[PDB]
Amino acid sequence: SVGIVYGDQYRQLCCSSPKFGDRYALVMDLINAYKLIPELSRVPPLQWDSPSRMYEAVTAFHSTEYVDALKKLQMLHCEEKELTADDELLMDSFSLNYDCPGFPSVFDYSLAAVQGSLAAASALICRHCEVVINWGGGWHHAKRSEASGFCYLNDIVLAIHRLVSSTRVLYVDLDLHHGDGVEEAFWYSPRVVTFSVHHASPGFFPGTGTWNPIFLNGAGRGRFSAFNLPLEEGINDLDWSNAIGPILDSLNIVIQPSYVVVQCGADCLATDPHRIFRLTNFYPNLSGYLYAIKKILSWKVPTLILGGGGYNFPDTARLWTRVTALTIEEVKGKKMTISPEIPEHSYFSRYGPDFELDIDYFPDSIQKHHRRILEQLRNYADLNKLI
Numbered sequence: 001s002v003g004i005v006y007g008d009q010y011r012q013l014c015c016s017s018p019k020f021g022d023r024y025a026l027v028m029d030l031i032n033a034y035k036l037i038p039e040l041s042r043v044p045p046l047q048w049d050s051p052s053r054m055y056e057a058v059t060a061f062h063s064t065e066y067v068d069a070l071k072k073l074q075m076l077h078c079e080e081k082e083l084t085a086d087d088e089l090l091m092d093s094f095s096l097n098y099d100c101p102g103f104p105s106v107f108d109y110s111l112a113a114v115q116g117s118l119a120a121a122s123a124l125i126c127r128h129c130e131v132v133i134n135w136g137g138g139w140h141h142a143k144r145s146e147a148s149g150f151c152y153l154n155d156i157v158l159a160i161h162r163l164v165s166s167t168r169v170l171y172v173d174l175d176l177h178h179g180d181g182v183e184e185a186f187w188y189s190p191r192v193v194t195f196s197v198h199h200a201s202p203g204f205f206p207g208t209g210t211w212n213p214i215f216l217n218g219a220g221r222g223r224f225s226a227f228n229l230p231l232e233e234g235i236n237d238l239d240w241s242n243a244i245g246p247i248l249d250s251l252n253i254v255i256q257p258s259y260v261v262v263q264c265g266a267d268c269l270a271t272d273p274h275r276i277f278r279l280t281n282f283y284p285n286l287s288g289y290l291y292a293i294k295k296i297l298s299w300k301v302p303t304l305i306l307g308g309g310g311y312n313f314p315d316t317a318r319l320w321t322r323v324t325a326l327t328i329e330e331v332k333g334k335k336m337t338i339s340p341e342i343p344e345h346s347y348f349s350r351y352g353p354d355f356e357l358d359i360d361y362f363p364d365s366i367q368k369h370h371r372r373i374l375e376q377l378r379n380y381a382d383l384n385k386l387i
């Protein structure tokens with residue numbers, strides 16, 4: 001089956017943050033509006049037996065002190081008094097500031113994504129599902145003891161850790177931004193191969209995933225196991241597809257992963273406020289995203305599909321609705337017919353004034369990168385005695 005993470009409480013928490021507002025509600029209600037929910041197996045977010053069990057789960061990656069600080073940030077934001085100078089210094093020491101502010105639900109919001117993606121991983125491990133989707137997850141920037149890029153807890157790292165502790169995982173990061181937190185977590189780990197394609201340029205967040213000059217690619221027994229493809233602004237569906245397709249296929253052939261984890265941040269869409277890449281959600285009766293997901297699913301490897309960035313909420317819903325339909329089609333072999341017109345539902349008016357499923361958009365260095373990545377993959381196979 002195809003699983004999808006949702007729940008009443010989960011929805012409320014995923015909609016409680018200042019940055020992402022009600023995006024998750026638009027996403028799930030558009031999926032529902034197109035009658036996809038009956039095709040899908042609801043995966044309930046993970047809940048724990050005790051505080052100690054929750055802390056044990058989260059501090060598989062994060063430090064206890066950071067988890068403590070994040071919980072304290074929530075408490076402090078639930079009372080009306082300003083932070084003390086000492087508490088400001090504490091939060092600053094974990095980068096719980098500026099891009100990663102406190103708010104009254106910051107811990108519950110952050111934890112919910114972890115609950116969803118851990119449950120998604122268990123559903124794959126027990127083979128209840130061949131693919132699980134979590135549009136509430138995908139927070140790839142969070143580090144062991146540092147919030148970053150509005151990522152407070154790295155649900156992806158925790159999900160991948162659960163998978164490898166059940167084995168090789170291929171992590172594919174389609175976000176506009178470099179997947180630095182996940183890459184770092186598994187920097188010394190050859191069994192989790194990470195691959196991020198992203199924009200990179202001087203001063204662009206977060207700065208990594210590019211010439212450092214040479215490309216760093218892991219360390220210790222993890223050498224050659226972190227792959228990166230930085231791309232210049234303006235790339236369209238076809239050029240992005242041609243850039244990553246051979247990489248994806250070669251990584252699957254050489255690594256033979258037991259699981260694939262895909263981060264599908266929607267901020268590469270031409271209509272995202274970043275206005276960096278020119279990807280679409282187009283699906284001829286072709287979106288770079290849909291090209292990549294269809295390719296990954298053709299491998300028939302259990303797959304976790306996560307969200308991430310995406311700051312045009314209706315267009316992110318438009319993309320992830322199509323990704324969800326495509327996953328149903330590829331996994332179940334069942335035709336999905338999505339009307340070109342947005343169906344009437346609670347958020348119908350957010351898709352105006354045209355109310356189409358298509359987003360409103362009219363559409364050498366890469367060869368160098370491919371040679372470099374092929375060599376690195378050769379080096380990775382040699383180091384790990386792969387055939």
Ligand SMILES: COc1ccc(C(=O)NO)cc1NC(=O)c1ccc(Cl)cc1Cl
Pocket residue numbers: 099141149150175176177205265267273274308309310311
């Ligand atoms: C500091 O900013 C960021 C950090 C991480 C990620 C992201 O998407 N992670 O992958 C995105 C942003 N950028 C944004 O907030 C952002 C930037 C420009 C505009 Cl116009 C709107 C937004 Cl919401």
Ligand SMILES: [K+]
Pocket residue numbers: 173174175176177178179196197198
């Ligand atoms: K990326």
Ligand SMILES: [K+]
Pocket residue numbers: 186187188189190191192193194218222225226
């Ligand atoms: K790695």
Ligand SMILES: [Zn+2]
Pocket residue numbers: 175176177265267308309310
């Ligand atoms: Zn992003």
